[PDB]
Design a protein around this ligand. Sequence first.
Ligand SMILES: C[C@H]1CCCN(c2ncnc3[nH]ccc23)[C@H]1CO
Length: 166
Amino acid sequence: NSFSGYLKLTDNVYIKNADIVEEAKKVKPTVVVNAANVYLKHGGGVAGALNKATNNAMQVESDDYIATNGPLKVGGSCVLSGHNLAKHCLHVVGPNVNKGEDIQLLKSAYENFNQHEVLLAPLLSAGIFGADPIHSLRVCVDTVRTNVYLAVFDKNLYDKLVSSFL
Ligand SMILES: C[C@H]1CCCN(c2ncnc3[nH]ccc23)[C@H]1CO
């Protein structure tokens, strides 16, 4: 793909200080990952921002998905359209550690990435779900074996992540 300006972290994990929405608009990847909740209610953070960029089409599609299939599992995922941003969106639910959900489920969440050869993705559980971002990055690197391009919006956090020893 046309991923540009990324820093290599490992054999298969690359990182960039960017809004995942802007990266998706530029690159139009096969798969963009959403940091979803089990109800696919895309209110804020990555999910709200991706949905807004689709003019709410992501939410309309998600509502039909839930009406048919019910909620996702914590640690689970589903593949839906990427609309104008990507071919597909992999909606992945990391644990909400601020609500007592088991942080071990973060590994299960990242395992979903292994079903896709290349992904543009955020750090799961590292926003309002309250997991330590360095921990989320470590779980990502230790779990995902396919090619993952991570976008981290916050500059201060990015700078910290890339100066940390995993
Ligand atoms: C570690 C993440 C926590 C959630 C929010 N973050 C985003 N990263 C990339 N693109 C994004 N778009 C909108 C939000 C957003 C990261 C922090 O900046």
